[PDB]
């Protein structure tokens, strides 16, 4: 990352156009709850009801996620290991239960400084500050740009605006990170509370939202199911990314390491929650991708049909492969590439090669 390391390494120049993508594939999503994954030579065939549903060219493959009760041939697992393609296991709802590792990652100093960071309270405090500030700044951006009123709501209510702006101010004025939890919760509460203000230009049929039903494991709402799904299923992406760069995705600074939720990546994703998960939910709902009949009721709550999951994952994938412009480096780059570049930049900041971590605020 020479241009970037220079430009942030404060010997100011202008970063040049990106050296493009090379040697990167596409992920493998297995949502069909009763599919059977088998290796044939270098091809990988997915079959359901003993019929060849599809196959993926192994080289073009880059990741594998196994939702729910899908089946993997041991040989296929071996093959993936030999091309050290990461593989992950997800609950039927998408709970991130397990994955594989391979003899650790080659680097060590990266992890070493990662832990040194992990044991400097002030570094952790500052990083959490910046993370949540970026998060609520992306809430700035999404809220006002994407607000859909028909007339006299078309502009976001400016009381909200200084509301959240004072929130960012308090955020950098957080003395410790418990106060940071409090600020985080308050801002997020207002944000979700107002969230309904744009989807379809207002709630649809059965698409009503209950903002209290966050922190609530089996979702009781359609939109809550969608949001939790998007959150958790993004989380996997982040986990893979940080594993690839030698970081221990579990050793976090702000979030704390409990099951199914890797602490460091849990931290890492917060700025991207609106740009990625929220954006996708909005896209699908407004674009009529997902409707009331798309969901299934249960005592557990709102769950997704096969067609729902099909299409939701497809949209999310497209969002990954949606190009944007880096605010500081001002060139087109996929969100997915952004993941690695942010990761490696973090690494460098841990190594002290750069003064401070870029938080990617839009």
């Amino acid at each position: 990352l020479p241009d970037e390391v220079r430009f942030l390494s404060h010997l100011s120049v202008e970063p040049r156009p990106i050296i493009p993508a090379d040697g990167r594939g596409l992920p493998l999503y297995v949502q069909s709850p009763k599919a059977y994954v088998r290796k044939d030579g270098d091809c990988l065939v997915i079959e359901e009801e003993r019929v060849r549903v599809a196959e993926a060219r192994l080289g073009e493959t880059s990741q594998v996620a196994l939702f729910g009760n899908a089946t993997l041939t041991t040989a296929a697992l071996h093959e993936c290991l030999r091309r050290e393609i990461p593989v992950t296991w997800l609950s039927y709802g998408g709970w991130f239960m397990g994955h594989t590792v391979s003899t650790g990652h080659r680097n060590v100093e990266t992890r070493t400084y990662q832990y040194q960071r992990s044991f400097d309270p002030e570094t952790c405090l500052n990083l959490a500050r910046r993370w949540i500030v970026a998060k609520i700044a992306n809430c700035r951006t999404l809220l006002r740009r994407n607000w859909r009123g028909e007339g006299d709501e078309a502009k976001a209510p400016p009381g909200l605006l200084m509301s959240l702006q004072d929130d960012m101010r308090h955020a950098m004025r957080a003395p410790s990170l418990e106060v940071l939890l409090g600020i985080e919760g308050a801002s997020a509460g207002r944000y979700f509370q107002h969230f309904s203000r744009m989807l379809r230009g207002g709630d649809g049929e059965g698409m009503g939202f209950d903002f209290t039903t966050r922190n609530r494991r089996p979702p009781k709402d359609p939109v809550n199911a969608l949001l939790s799904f998007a959150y958790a299923m993004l989380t996997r992406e982040w986990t893979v990314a940080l594993a690839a760069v030698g970081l221990d995705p579990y050793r976090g600074f702000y979030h704390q390491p409990r099951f199914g939720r890797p602490a460091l990546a849990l931290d890492m994703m917060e700025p991207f929650r609106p740009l990625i998960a929220d954006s996708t939910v909005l896209m699908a709902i407004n674009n009529g991708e997902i409707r009331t009949g798309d969901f299934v009721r249960s005592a557990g709550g709102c769950n997704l049909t096969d067609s729902a999951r099909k299409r939701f994952i497809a949209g999310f994938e497209r969002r990954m492969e949606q190009e944007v412009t880096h605010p500081i480096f001002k060139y087109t780059i996929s969100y997915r590439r952004l993941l690695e570049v942010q990761a490696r930049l973090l690494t460098r900041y841990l190594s002290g090669e750069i003064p401070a971590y870029p938080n990617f605020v839009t």
Binding site: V30, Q31, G41, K310
Partner: protein, 95 residues
């Protein structure tokens, strides 16, 4: 920057035919009775090139690889009269 390729083979050995065959499955998609469409990048086109000089037997088999182009605007270059052609698409497979 991504390109599309079309490959045709004539082989005179069932052994080599097997090997070449599903190694080719490793690279593209079957399209015609002895032809595969192939949407690839430089690194793997070179990998292809390497594999098939060496499964294949030179003096006496024959294979052809044809770069149609960038594969954004392929079908302006293609015409099918049997089943309809439409090229490879890169999305993750989600089934």
């Amino acid at each position: 920057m991504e390109h599309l390729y079309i490959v045709s083979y004539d082989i005179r050995n069932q052994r080599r035919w097997r090997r070449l065959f599903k190694t080719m499955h490793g690279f593209g998609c079957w399209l015609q009775l002895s032809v595969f469409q192939c949407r690839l990048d430089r690194i793997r086109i070179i990998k292809m090139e390497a594999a098939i000089n060496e499964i294949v037997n030179h003096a006496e088999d024959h294979v052809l690889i044809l770069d149609l182009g960038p594969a954004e605007n392929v079908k302006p270059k293609v015409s099918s009269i049997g089943k309809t052609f439409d090229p490879i698409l890169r999305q993750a497979v989600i089934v």
